[PDB]
UniProtKB/Swiss-Prot annotation, chain A:
Protein name as it appears in the record: Transcription antitermination protein NusB
UniProt family annotation: Belongs to the NusB family.
Covalent S-S links between cysteines: none
Transcription in keyword set: yes
InterPro entries tied to this protein: NusB-like_sf, NusB_fam, NusB_RsmB_TIM44
Record's GO cellular component terms: cytosol
GO biological process entries: DNA-templated transcription termination; transcription antitermination
Gene expressing this chain: nusB
Organism superkingdom: Bacteria
Keywords of the record: RNA-binding, Transcription, Transcription antitermination, Transcription regulation
UniProtKB/Swiss-Prot annotation, chain B:
GO BP terms in the entry: translation
One Pfam family from the record: Ribosomal_S10
Similarity remark: Belongs to the universal ribosomal protein uS10 family.
InterPro entries: Ribosomal_uS10, Ribosomal_uS10_CS, Ribosomal_uS10_dom, Ribosomal_uS10_dom_sf
Gene behind this protein: rpsJ
Function: Involved in the binding of tRNA to the ribosomes.
Organism: Escherichia coli O157:H7
Assembly with partners or alone: Part of the 30S ribosomal subunit.
Keyword Membrane annotated: no
Name of protein: Small ribosomal subunit protein uS10
Superkingdom classification of source: Bacteria
Ribonucleoprotein is among the record's keywords: yes
Matching SUPFAM superfamilies: Ribosomal protein S10
Swiss-Prot record, chain C:
Gene: nusA
Residues of the full protein shown: 165 to 330 of 495
Subcellular location: Cytoplasm
Lineage of the organism: Bacteria, Pseudomonadati, Pseudomonadota, Gammaproteobacteria, Enterobacterales
Coiled-coil stretches noted in the UniProt entry, renumbered to this chain: none
Function: Participates in both transcription termination and antitermination.
Subunit composition and interactions: Monomer. Binds directly to the core enzyme of the DNA-dependent RNA polymerase and to nascent RNA.
UniProt family annotation: Belongs to the NusA family.
Protein name: Transcription termination/antitermination protein NusA
Amino acid sequence: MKPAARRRARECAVQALYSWQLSQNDIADVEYQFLAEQDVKDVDVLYFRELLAGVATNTAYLDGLMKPYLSRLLEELGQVEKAVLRIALYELSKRSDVPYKVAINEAIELAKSFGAEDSHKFVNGVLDKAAPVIRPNKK
Amino acid sequence: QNQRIRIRLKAFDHRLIDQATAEIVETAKRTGAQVRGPIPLPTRKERFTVLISPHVNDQYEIRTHLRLVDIVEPTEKTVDALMRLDLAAGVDVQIS
Amino acid sequence: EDMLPRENFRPGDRVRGVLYSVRPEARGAQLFVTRSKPEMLIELFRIEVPEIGEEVIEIKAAARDPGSRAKIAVKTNDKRIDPVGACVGMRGARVQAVSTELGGERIDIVLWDDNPAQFVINAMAPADVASIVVDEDKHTMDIAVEAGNLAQAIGRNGQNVRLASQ
């Protein structure tokens, strides 16, 4: 139902937000470098801007959501898992054009292809315990 | 100062290489310049066999990731810290 | 004597070592560096595994015979992390790199225990221990081995179990 440009924009947004949260710089300069120096010919511009703006304005919101779900972890919290959970919970909080099962399926694909071979079940557990709370309608 | 600086970064374990990446970001930010990256790669599995006895009549997937560091304006203290640091055994810090 | 017995380097080789001794009043050699002392192994397990420095895994005892055989004891504080399974790492990929540094030296990463007899039972990791009679007044720990597992437990010259003593 959706072309590969949305998937490419989502993966480039995962890469850009991981680079922002690990390099710890300004979001505007890193965003301008990532849009003027990387492959953006198959990247949805408005999807990228709205997703990064929502993550940048809901840093503390998604951290407060993640804070009750950082107890039973054997190791400590990684950064790739945090980026996948932030993008997955913003795609399940305010995004109306993206469906519920479609966003969960893309989040599971991102967690299996980027997080780990063992952290994608943690991502799916946090999503299954948070997305009916955030979206009881499951839209 | 050979200002066009490329770094590819190999990862078997993501935690150790994220630790080394944070160390690279720290040793680049404490010298004056600012660092960019990583912009990571998805799961690139390996084809590695084991030394096991055959059955008369382990692992197959090795989750490896790549990270990218671009430096365009270095200092002498930055390349000195890149030539006076230490690392963990078995990982690659190859400045391409 | 501080190096390995087969190290012959060349001009232009970044070699790594540990400062261990100093004599500033003496006019001669004043900064002694080693590569074959077990404090180098402590520094290797500190640089390699992060959670040992993050106060999760406690390395208390270690012993080596360089190039051939070594033992080291770890102990977790967080029960959520296996100490031996993480200090060995995934597929032993960490300590084998440490075996790159020591040249094939088999490093037994075992679990520290407060009971010394159960610690020696845990310490013979490529071996098997049946029973240990501890008499510290006579300074003896009589260790029973199973039949057939004598050569893999003793090894060369009884050294590694002596390293287990160390």
